[PDB]
Amino acid sequence: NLPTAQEVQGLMARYIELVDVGDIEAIVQMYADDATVEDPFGQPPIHGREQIAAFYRQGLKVRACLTGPVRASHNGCGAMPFRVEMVWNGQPCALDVIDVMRFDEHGRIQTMQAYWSEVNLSV
Amino acid sequence: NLPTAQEVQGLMARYIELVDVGDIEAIVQMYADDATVEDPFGQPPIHGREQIAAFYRQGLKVRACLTGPVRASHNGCGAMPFRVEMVWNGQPCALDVIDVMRFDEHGRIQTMQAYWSEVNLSV
């Protein structure tokens, strides 16, 4: 069903758990089959599970953690602040990001937008 | 001009400064004359400076602070996490919110959406 505010908080927290462990197959399954992803926002979106799996496989030694609570509305939308830590060519860096997600009538991510740019990178 | 990523960070930080001191007239001036505000997201928007000034006058002993950095893109958009502390009928409460804003070709807030619901309230 369309996730309630409480369900949206749980789903988005799970998403960060999956990104942290790096379970690409579990991440891809959270998305609707025809979902779109705009990461970083401003860049053209990728559509469908195939392109989404490719995107995550490429992106994922990475650890992610929520840096604040998940803000959720009553219409299946949520926004959350988090940090991603990686090692860019020997040198370890961090990225502060805010994801905005809209879930569908089935509890799957219909659309995801990630807000960040170089101003949010620490290398 | 269309704010750069760095300018978006500065504008959004200023916005929280204004909300914190409670300078309603300075807040209203940051918006475009025909801007829309959806606070909380899910609720119908209010349009134009008149309705926006009314909204802030009604909403504003309140203190607000950024609880993390402003995430900014290259297309005039930004997202930021913050907390608002107030006193609801004798009892002091807090609200964790995430605002997403889009600026226009003049550096004014064209649209603002606030993500939060009762799950983000501590009373």
3-state secondary structure of B66: strand
Are B3 and B103 spatial neighbours (Cβ–Cβ below 8 Å)?
yes
Residues of chain B in contact with residue A5, where contact means CB-CB under 8 angstroms, are 117-119
Contact call for A72 and B118, based on CB within 8 A: no
Structural domains of chain A, count: 1
CATH number of domain containing B99: 3.10.450.50
Residue A14, φ and ψ in degrees, nearest 5: -65, -45
Distance between CA atoms of residues A3 and A101, nearest Å: 12
Q: Is B34 annotated as a binding residue?
A: no
Q: Pick from B80, B101, B115: which is nearest to B32 by CA?
A: B101
For B95, the domain range is 1-123
Residues of chain B in contact with residue A75, where contact means CB-CB under 8 angstroms, are 41-42
Which structural technique was applied?
A: X-ray
The full 3-state SS of chain A, as one line of letters, equals CCCCHHHHHHHHHHHHHHHHHCCHHHHHCCEEEEEEEECCECECCEEHHHHHHHHHHHHCCCEEEECCCCEECCCCEEEEEEEEEEEECCEEEEEEEEEEEEECCCCCEEEEEEECCHHHEEC
Q: Pick from B13, B100, B112: which is nearest to B64 by CA?
A: B13
Distance between CA atoms of residues A98 and B98, nearest Å: 9
Catalytic positions of B, please?
15, 39
Enumerate chain B positions whose Cβ falls within 8 A of a Cβ in A: 5-6, 9, 40-42, 67-69, 71-75, 77-81, 96-98, 100, 115-120
